């Protein structure tokens, strides 16, 4: 695309915030900034690293339902996002956030960028970087804590080449998985038999 900025409309104002937007869009490229707009309820501007990332986000996220609303994702005519008059969202978090230095961006080198799955939303999220003996029940209890729908089923892949786990989280619908992605991505999981917590990674 001609610009690294996109606009997202049809967000749920009570549910969404900058981190939760990042948690969805980071699947498709580096996210630099998210800005909610007082005058356009349900809309946010998102600056990605480049127009290739914008295009991937549009092609994969445009027209998807989340919290009863159709999300629309489209190119912005702005070349960049600037902090405006920042305000507190419904959840008490700030309307503007810069993620350019985030450890959780996944496309920071060309080599790293190429390893990311680029898939359309479906009713399954893949997870990785979970604790070594993570269980279905562990994910159930995290979803309860977050106030999001439990997956109907959790698969933990048996094969493990590091002290971490990967697998699948399944819901009955696309929209349930997408709604959950924004809340659950980058959750800090407690690590029993291990000294540091694990940052849960989700993707389609
Ligand atoms: Cl929905
Ligand atoms: Cl892929
Ligand atoms: Cl945990
Ligand atoms: Cl980690």
UniProtKB/Swiss-Prot annotation:
Modified residues annotated as Phosphoserine in this record: 3, 166
Subunit and partners: Identified in a IGF2BP1-dependent mRNP granule complex containing untranslated mRNAs. Interacts with HNRNPLL. Interacts with APEX1; the interaction is DNA-dependent. Component of a complex with SETD2. Interacts with ELAVL1. Part of a transcription inhibitory ribonucleoprotein complex composed at least of the circular RNA circZNF827, ZNF827 and HNRNPK. Interacts with CHD8 in an RNA-dependent manner.
Entry comment, domain topic: RRM domain 2 has moderate RNA-binding affinity. RRM domains 3 and 4 may facilitate RNA looping when binding to two appropriately separated binding sites within the same target pre-mRNA.
Record's subcellular location: Nucleus, Nucleoplasm; Cytoplasm
Cross-link (Glycyl lysine isopeptide (Lys-Gly) (interchain with G-Cter in SUMO2)): 190
Domain RRM positions: 4-101, 117-204
The protein's name: Heterogeneous nuclear ribonucleoprotein L
Annotated GO biological process: mRNA processing; negative regulation of DNA-templated transcription; regulation of alternative mRNA splicing, via spliceosome
Segment of the intact protein contained: 376 to 579 of 586
Endpoints of the signal sequence: none
Gene for this chain: Hnrnpl
Organism placement in taxonomy: Eukaryota, Metazoa, Chordata, Craniata, Vertebrata
UniProt keyword list: Acetylation, Cytoplasm, Isopeptide bond, Methylation, Nucleus, Phosphoprotein, Repeat, Ribonucleoprotein, RNA-binding, Ubl conjugation
């Amino acid at each position: 695309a001609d610009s690294p900025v996109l606009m997202v409309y049809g967000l749920d104002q009570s549910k969404m915030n900058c981190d939760r937007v990042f948690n969805v869009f980071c699947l498709y490229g580096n996210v630099e900034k998210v800005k909610f707009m007082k005058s356009k309820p349900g809309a946010a501007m998102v600056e990605m690293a480049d127009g290739y990332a914008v295009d991937r986000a549009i092609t994969h996220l445009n027209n998807n339902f989340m919290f009863g609303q159709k999300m629309n994702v489209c190119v912005s005519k702005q070349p960049a996002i600037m902090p405006g008059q920042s305000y507190g969202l419904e959840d008490g978090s700030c309307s503007y956030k810069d993620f350019s230095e985030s450890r959780n961006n996944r496309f920071s080198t060309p080599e790293q960028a190429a390893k990311n799955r680029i898939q359309h939303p479906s009713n399954v999220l893949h997870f990785f970087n979970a604790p070594l003996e993570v269980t279905e029940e562990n994910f159930f209890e995290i979803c309860d804590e977050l106030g999001v729908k439990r997956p109907t089923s959790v698969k933990v892949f048996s094969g493990k080449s590091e002290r971490s786990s990967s697998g699948l989280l399944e819901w009955d619908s696309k929209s349930d998985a997408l709604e959950t992605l924004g809340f659950l991505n980058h959750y800090q999981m407690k690590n029993p038999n291990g000294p540091y917590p694990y940052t849960l990674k989700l993707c389609f």
